[PDB]
Every structure is written in C-alpha cells, then in structure tokens.
Amino acid sequence: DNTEIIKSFKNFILEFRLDSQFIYRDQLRNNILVKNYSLTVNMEHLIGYNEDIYKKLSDEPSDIIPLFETAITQVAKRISILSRPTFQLILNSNANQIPLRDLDSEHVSKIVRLSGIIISTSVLSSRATYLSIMCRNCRHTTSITTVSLPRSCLSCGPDPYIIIHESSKFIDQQFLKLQEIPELVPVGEMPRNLTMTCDRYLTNKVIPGTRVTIVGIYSIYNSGVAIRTPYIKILGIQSFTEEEEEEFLQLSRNPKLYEILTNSIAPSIFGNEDIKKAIVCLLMGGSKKILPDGMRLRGDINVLLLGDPGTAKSQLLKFVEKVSPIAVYTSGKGSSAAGLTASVQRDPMTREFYLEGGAMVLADGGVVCIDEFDKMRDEDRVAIHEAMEQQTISIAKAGITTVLNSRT
Amino acid sequence: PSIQLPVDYNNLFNEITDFLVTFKQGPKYMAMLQKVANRELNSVIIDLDDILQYQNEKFLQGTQADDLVSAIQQNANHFTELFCRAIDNNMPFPPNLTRRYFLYFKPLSQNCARRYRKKAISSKPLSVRQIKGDFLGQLITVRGIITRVSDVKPAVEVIAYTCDQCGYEVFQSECTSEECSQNQTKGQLFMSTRASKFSAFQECKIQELSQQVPVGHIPRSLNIHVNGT
C-alpha cells in the first residue's frame, strides 16, 4: 500500500517536468554532484502534481515523511548509480502561515507554517541515526536504525546488548528558540516563544535576531500537572503586489514626494520641519559599504534630541515606532546592558546554556527608540558604543566569550 | 594467567633471616629485637645500608647473594610483611590482627652506593614532578618542603566485635564464629571499640621548591602519609 507513495514520489522526482525540464531530477542530480545529500521539494509543485498524497501528508505525516526520507534516498542513489547516507528532505512553500498565537491543541502532528524571529540558538549536538550492537553474553551482533535497545538477546539476561561504537552512525542537531514579531504584538503582552529543532543541513543557518519563515511539524514532548512543552521539527526555513509596486513607483515619481512625506511625519505637530526631515533620513538610513580590508561602515543614522522639555520630543520617538517596520521602544531607566544587548542564559527545556539576544539585538535591521538616554548607566552606554561604531556586541560572561553583530 | 619472573622470595627470606641473625652491631638487629623483647621499644627501623653492607660482605666472601635491596626497592609493599614475618618468628587469632609494633626502612646513602660501586636511584633526592608511574610500589626518597599537615585522626586497621551467643572475639552485624555458624541462633554483633586496632595517622603534603620548578610552571605537590611512631 505504501509502495504507491514511494512510487508517486519517484515520479515526482524522476519524471516531474516543469519549464520543459526535469527540474527535480536535475536539481537532485546537481546536489549529488555537489555531494549535498538533501533535496528541496516545493510544496506548491506537490499539490499540483498529486493532491492525494498531499491529503495524507497534510493530515498524517507520521509515516509519510519516513517514506520521504527512504524514497528520496533510494531515488538519489539510483541517480548516483546512473551517473557513476540518508537524504534530508527540505520543503519550500508559499502557503498561508498560521499565527503563532493561533497554534492550539488541534494541529498536533500536523505540518504548519510560521513566521517569526530567532531570539536564541543552541550549540550543535550529535544524535544517533544508525546503530550496531553486540550481546555481551554471547557476542550476538545486529544492527538497529524513539529508539531503544532490545531487552533480550536474539540468539542472556536482561539488557544483554552493548553498542558497537566503531560501526555506528550519528547526525548533528540544533535547538532553536522562535518568537513572534514584537511589532505584531499588542501592548501589555510578551511575545510567545516557541522551541524549534533542526538537524543535518538545516543547522546553523540562522543566528539570534534573524527574521525567518518556518515550515515545520507541530508537536509536543514531555520535559505543571501534565504540561508538555511544544516543539517543532523543522522542515524548511526561508529568510509586494504588481499594483503596489506601481503605486509606490508613482510615489517615487511624485514631484513633491520629499515634502509630502516630510509633512506626513507626525502631522499632528506643527512646524518642526528640520527635525522631521532628519528623522525621515533615519527611516531610510544610509547605504552599506565594505572596505577592501573587510571592515564594514555603519550605515545607521543616529540622532540625539537635546532640547528643552515640552517640545514634543518624546512624541517624535513614539511616531517612529509606528512607522518603522522593525521598531523597539524602551526607556533609559527601565533598561539594562543584559536587557538591551545580548546575554547568555540556560534553557530549562533542553538544560543547556543558550546565547540570547536583547532589545538591541531584536531591533537589528530596524530602528530602536531609547528615551531618557542620559538616565541610563555608563555600562549600558559603553555597550551601545560598540553597537553604534562597530554594529557588534561582544559577550563575555561566566566562562564563554562571543561576538554578535547588531545593525541597529 | 600464570607467568614467570626471576624473583625468588625463598632465597630472599632465607637471606633476611640470615641477615637478621648474622649481621653484627652481637647482631645489630637481634639486639634491637632484644630491646623490643624486653618491651623497651615499640618500632623497628631497618637500615638498607646494613643490608647492602651484608650483601657486599657476602659478595667479597664469595658466598651466594641476591640483590635484596633492589627487591625491597621494587616491591616494598610485600617485603614489609616479610620482615614482620621474620620478626614475628625470630623476636626473643591470626598474628597480623594482633600486632601492635611498627616497622620502617631507612634509605640507602649515596656515599654507601658509590663506595660499593653502585647507583642508588631510589634514594636520589628527586622531586615530586619527576616521580613517574613506574615508581608505584617502590621505596623512594623525595626532597621537598612540607606545606600542609593534618591533625591526628583515628585509623582503624581491624574492627573488633564481641558476640553474646558465644563470647568469641570477632575481627573484621552477625557473628561469623564457628559456634554461631553451627548453631541455629546467632548473637548480634556490636562494636567493641576498646578492642579495635587503632593506628595513629596524619595527613601530610610535600611540594617542590622554587629552584625545582621548570620554566613558568606551578610547583607540584604529592601526598605523604605517616603512620605508627
């Protein structure tokens, strides 16, 4: 019965044709030439090629994605034999994503799509994928591919087998932390954080502070009375309308574009044309340049408001928070160097120490609005100096040292 | 699995008994054992130079001789009992559980080794850093400075019990004596502390001096344990 699923996959790789070419056969063949044992399957082609397997995969991927791994491995090895390990499945999709707050107890074991920003990552760890064992009582040998060792010999007492280390295979895995975009979070709420895991070629692609689009499986695992921690098996990560492009191109073609946008910034306030225009320059920011020696010029434009009280200077920062797509607003008093910049903390879910970003890390690639800048301590200012003039944050806590970029 | 080594304890033990009987001061050690026999002394110090002197005396006389000092050098753990065994039968419940005396060996002197045309590697004032794993179980002389000494602590060697059912003295919860093993009823054991074998023990540590330290390193330390008198 499941052989048809393998056969359909084989047709979808070897025989699927788009743009008058065997794109899936060729791209897998090219990956074999590169020796990259992974294939990027586009879900939009899958639905157009065979909806029946899509129904099974979308509803019950429990056995389908084991079939995905074994079928692609067989097909790719067939291509390798024709031209002259387990191939990782990678999924690219453009279907609608479900909001992170909308995940519930109903999408369990269902493939879902998400979008968010990575706030913390873990170090790589090795996990078993193929094992060979030997009985200590009678030297009986067998191979094994959650997974647990047999309790009795197949030829010896309870648990007679031991692992043959030199004839076993392992794969690498990483643990990631994802949370929703703070801009999409209404005030009075801390963005929900979700644990994600990635393995093999999908590891180490994203650092904390990177905005990503997620395609994965929603599931739980034990780690309250029965509160199991949710987690995601990562399947694929990615990181305007034609009429909108013409609309904004027409905006670029407006003769009074600069003045219209200048007036548009905080229209409730009167005059103040110069400070409006500089903040407009803050929104666009400079263009990045790289020295031939490898150094990078900071492209951010940082402005200080240093005038008398009651001049709408606080209101100017607030308006930017509502116009900048990536916006973080914080006060000088209610901030700390660890809160602003990066920090190192132990994840209680996996019992490991993770590198975790801060407010100045979340605002990477956008604009941050700090108020009462004079009221924050010098140590916070010192950490800002590195971010302002190098776009980097250096962390040295406990017994570990690291440097993290921050284009804030 | 059985193996063969050129070591022969039969020749050495006979030499030890002969050395005890013959080596003069009458005999030096027999006089020492006589004082112990007179209950005047509690510890026995064995001089390896005296043993080496006797070996050279036997060597110059052309009689049979085996390098007893090197045998004690290599395996001092077992030769300590052998000297006790010789004394336990030659001094003017199993015996080892009741012995209250103590025995030690003093090292060869470099002048003596050179005088007998030999090298006393064990007695060479080497540092703790230079003591490899090859020296485990070997009597060696260490030159250094003591940096920490602990106070006196009890060190029980054999734990004594008394049984209500038989009255026997049991040494090491239930009595293992012959009468209680035969009987269906066994008297429960209790700790007879006044009968347990206490040994005087202190913890000491030795460390290299500054001149013994290689370039830019930290002076290493080694544990020294002191027992008996």
Place this chain on the structure above:
Amino acid sequence: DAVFGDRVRRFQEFLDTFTSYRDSVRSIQVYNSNNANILPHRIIISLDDLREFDRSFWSGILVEPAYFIPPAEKALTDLADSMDDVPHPNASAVSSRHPWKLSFKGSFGAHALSPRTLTAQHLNKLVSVEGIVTKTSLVRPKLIRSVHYAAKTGRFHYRDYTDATTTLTTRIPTPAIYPTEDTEGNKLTTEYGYSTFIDHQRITVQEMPEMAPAGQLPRSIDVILDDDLVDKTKPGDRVNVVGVFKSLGAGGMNQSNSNTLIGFKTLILGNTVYPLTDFDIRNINKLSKKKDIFDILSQSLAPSIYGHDHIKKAILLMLMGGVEKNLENGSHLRGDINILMVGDPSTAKSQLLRFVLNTASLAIATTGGLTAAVTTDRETGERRLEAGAMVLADRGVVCIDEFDKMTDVDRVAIHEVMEQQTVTIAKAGIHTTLNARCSVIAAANPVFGQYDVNRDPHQNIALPDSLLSRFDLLFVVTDDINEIRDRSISEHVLRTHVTIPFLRKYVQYAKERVIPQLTQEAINVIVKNYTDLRNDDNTKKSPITARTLETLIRLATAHAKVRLSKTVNKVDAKVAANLLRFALL
C-alpha cells in the same frame, strides 16, 4: 581473528619494504642500550609512503582506525621486541614489555579539519585538527598490565586490562580491580615493581579566533594523550593534533531515557602533536652602508601615515633596542626602549599602532590578566596560572590602546616592568619572579577629546609622573588643519570611497647579531648634552633626569644596530641628542 594477523604481517612488510623506518628504531634501540634517559617507543609514519605501499591499509588508518591501527601497533611492537635479544638481566622483564606507538605525517587528504568543521560525519576516523590549547587536565597514571605472584603455587601470574579510550575497537570492558586471587583461588602476592602503568592526560582544543565568524559561540573538542604526550603542551599553545575522533557512552539508549536533548559524547584519541637567507643577509648588511637607509627604512614604516618622520624613526629605533649589561656586583642594566603617544583619539594613533602591531613579529595587543598573577582552575578543581601580555612579550613589543583607560592595579605592576624588566609576583601561596623584558608602545587621549597643546599630558591626561617618566619617547599629534595639505592625505582616503618582508629580515638580523658597545666618541657628547639639558631651565615636555641620559645611550645603541656596527660612533649620539630635543620640545 585471522584478519587481524593478516594486517599485522602487512604492516611488518611495510616496515621492511622501507628500511628507513626500522633503522631509526634500531638507532633508538642502540641509544637505549648505551644509557643502561630513555627515548620514546614512537615513530612517525608517512601516510604518502603508506599510500603507495597499500592504499587500502593507508585508507584503513584514515577511515577505519579500529580495525587497522591495532594490527599496526602489534606489528611495530613485534618488530621492536624481536630485533634484539635484550640481554639486560632485569630490565628485560619490565622495560622491554612496553608496546610501541605510532605517529603519522604527510598528506592528510580530506582529514584536515577544525573544531568547527569537525562534525558527526567525521566520527571513527583518524583526522588532523587545528586549534588552540585552552586548558590541560591533571596527569594520573593508568593501569595497563598487572603482575602478581601466586605464593601458594610458587609461580607468578599476570592480567591485562582494556579501556574504552585505549581500545580503538569495542573490546569487552574489564572493570575488575587488580586481582587478589587467581584461577587457583590462592591469595596473590602483588608485584608492583613488575606491573606496567601509563600516564594519561586530557586537553581541550578550541577553534582559532582567526577564522571564527561573529554571532556564534566558539567550537571546542577534547583530545586524549598518554605516555610520552602526557605533558608536552601548556594552555594557550597553537597546536595541530592528529588523532582518532571517536564517540563514547550512549545518548540515553539504555532503558527508556528518551529525552530529545541528550546527545552522544565525542572526543579525539590524539596520537601525534604538532605544537605551533645569506643573499638577504648580505643585502641587509650592504644596504646599511648607504647614508639614507635610516630614512628609507623610516619611510617604508607606516605607509598610510603622511609625515611623522620622527615617530617612524622612533619605531625603528625601538625595534632595534639597546644593549643590556651585567656587573660583577650582580646588577643588570636595562637596554630596551619605550614610546608613548598622546593627543586626539582618532587622529592617526590607531593607524600607527595597527601597522606596528601587524608588522612586529612578537607584537601583543593590550587595552584597558596582563599582570600574569591570577590562576585558572581545571574541571576537577586544580588551578594553574595564566600568562600575561607583559610576561609573554619578553624580547618582544607591547602594543597598548586606551592606555589612559587601564586600571591603577595595572599601573603599579607595570612600574617594575618598564624599569626593572621583571614582575615580582607575591600572592597567597604563590611567589615567583618573571622576566618582563618587553618594549612598550602606547597611545592615550585627553578627557575632553581636544588636546590643549599649551600644557603637558600631566594635566591634559593626568597620569602619574612616575609612570610617565618610564617612557623613553613621547609624541603628541593633533590634526591641526592645513587644508591643501589635508587634501593631499584625504585624496587617498577619497580614493577608497624597502619591502616589509625584507625589512622584517633587516630588523631581525640587525638585532640578532649586532651588540654595539660604547666608544669614547659618544662619551663627551652624552655628558655635554646632558649637562646642557640640565642647564636649560626653559619649559620642556619633561624635566631632565638621569633616565634621559639612559635614553640617549639606548637610542644611540639602537642607531648603531641600524648601522650594524658593534661599536657606537659620534654620529649615533648626535642623532639621539637631536631626537630627544624634538621629543622634549
């Protein structure tokens, strides 16, 4: 099995088809017989030679160490144990029983990795890893073979042991302690003098920062060393290590233990450690004879800085250094030279320091553990001192940025460094003296950012006069604007919007061979100029003290090294006197 014996004979054939290996073993055997120190029972195998003799066996070491190396170890041990009769009366029973270990060299193929590049795909393979020694564990002996005597039966006995680390192949573990009774059941007489023990140590190797990308924690891996490699490295050393990358334990496979976070422990079974011309010389000496070589070398230095000829000359003189002396009373004389830079922060100070730090062979960057009087502990609790930049820069140069930002604890420690070239460590339970013969170049800035040229740094920067007097040369630079001149230097910046490799040989050779002594020519010059400076009551950068006389001797000696003359001349003192006047104005 029979396969094990086949590869033992195959390795014996390799040891015979190239006699260049086993003849060095014979050289070791001959040397060890004469010393009746001991040479190690280790040889280095060229993988290329092994590649051309047996491709499968050569690939066997790289790909399947567990099934190829132990056959090779036995074959080498067999060859050493049979090439001589070992006529030693007693040493033949203990010393000759130590097996012979292997080392590897040549092309590593794909197995040349880093802690970052090392992954699970590289397990169970012999690989070469490049990194830095962060720390070393404590050394302990490890039992290998036990020897005991069965007194009741009248014959000796023995027993071997296996460990998951020492056995590349998964042999049955032997957790048993040294036996007390053998098969006969009689109590055994322990033979410590004939048992075999081998030392063991653990080290941690981390990826070098030179290739580390930002935004990630560093990658590290543990390496296991035994016997001869047990104490061959110290923390902080760059190292290339070749060993078997092998896993241990189980990731919760026993019972249920099905947590998703548990992974398999991995480490490297290291077995080879690699710690990290006359034509030019005749050209170096020949170039010294032209009059402008001092100026030409002073222009190749700092090509990105226009002007500052005296500073560039000062850098050359500081690299050349003076000459140290010893006295019959037991005293020693400092010879090195220090330079200090002061003025506006971004103006050419970081640029000059960047060139010197990159050019100098033993340049260390410092900014405000340099005192080397602090300890770092191992994983088991034992601790070791960590070296400091001032100590490490012995016979080198110290590059300091943000010198004004250094703490008072650094200042009191560097007082003896710059004056006595030593560090007197006095801590709880630790007391030692370390040489600190390092030249010092530092940069400092005023608090206000804009330097008040009318006043000395004692009020613009407010460092203690005792600390400031320890610098032989001081320079103040500030971007006083001449628009046509600043245009000339900014055009090259706007363009972005003697060869150094031979010069470093010139600096190396001159200091390596030339040790100039004083001459009557400079004696009168030194006394007269020093007296004139003392007579000059006009304001200067610093008052005239005996250290100024010391600086003149140091500078004149440095110029003689530029001239590569082992005796000083009147011209050397003349240059030093003029340069000091420029630094004092």
